[PDB]
Ligand SMILES: [Hg+2]
């Protein structure tokens with residue numbers, strides 16, 4: 446429970462490499478910005494309808510304000526694995542939320 | 551000056567396609583020259599462009615005429631392929 | 647009172663032209679996207695400290711997803727008048743909020 | 752690998768500058784090679800670059816060491832020139 450910036454990654458499906466990459470992304474954030482950031486992965490295949498509170502922006506723009514290692518993983522997710530639709534960065538309270546190697550639930 | 555209605559879907563279904571064609575007809579016969587339907591299949595083409603974005607269906611669905619919203623509510627609740635929408639207001643840069 | 651996308655413009659000061667431009671921007675939004683959008687102008691000179699719920703992003707990225715006439719005014723605000731720091735686009739409930747020719751309070 | 756601490760201020764004041772220099776000293780003598788102070792005056796230079804952004808002071812102020820946060824709380828509450836902050840973690844691309 447804390448108030449931080451949640452990087453929302455919207456993906457359609459996943460591959461073994463994409464899951465590995467997201468876990469690495471999540472690890473880099475918690476290790477480098479212990480609290481300034483947090484990852485939340487949204488798989489549109491599991492939930493076609495987007496929660497009203499959600500919105501999806503193009504990666505190129507926003508991804509430029511993220512740490513360098515993050516821009517790298519993201520670049521591989523959309524360009525190489527092609528599972529990435531877009532993302533969002535939202536300040537929000539985290540605590541009635543879950544924690545697992547793949548970011549927040 | 552046209553309103554381009556962008557519909558982001560998670561693939562297609564037999565009915566999903568029935569709803570889309572009727573929607574497109576409803577804009578060509580009822581709101582001629584006011585809307586331009588554009589469907590983007592995400593489960594076919596994930597990668598969002600740079601000027602692109604997908605907003606919440608419940609919000610954009612409100613400024614739309616009652617019939618078009620009916621189909622939208624259908625694609626979101628009935629079929630369940632609708633991820634979200636986008637609404638643009640400008641001069642057509644490739645209306646095909 | 648409704649739930650829409652609030653384009654937040656963060657500015658430092660204003661000039662007669664910038665105020666005119668913001669009023670025009672506000673008018674275009676309410677007229678073209680009656681409800682899909684809404685403007686909120688934040689003058690950092692009047693409030694140096696940014697409300698915790700606020701964040702400011704670079705214009706070039708985000709401004710690309712806005713209507714064309716909006717990208718134009720914004721371009722004149724930052725490039726020509728130079729009052730524009732950055733912006734944000736946030737979905738939020740509007741109704742315990744005010745209304746005046748300069749967007750929301 | 753350095754943490755670049757970006758401080759966006761709305762101009763300066765006599766004390767504001769006293770606090771900044773002490774802060775910069777506190778990072779050069781106490782956390783040598785861990786932080787790199789960078790101040791950006793908005794009331795002097797409004798225009799945000801493209802890779803730039805300004806986040807909420809209360810959030811980023813928490814991951815910072817107690818003394819640096821003390822000054823930050825000072826520039827935000829005492830002086831009142833602090834608009835917000837930004838925190839970067841990377842290899843120095845012009846540390847001057
Ligand atoms: Hg709306």
Ligand SMILES: [Hg+2]
Nearest residue numbers: 448449480810
């Ligand atoms: Hg935080």
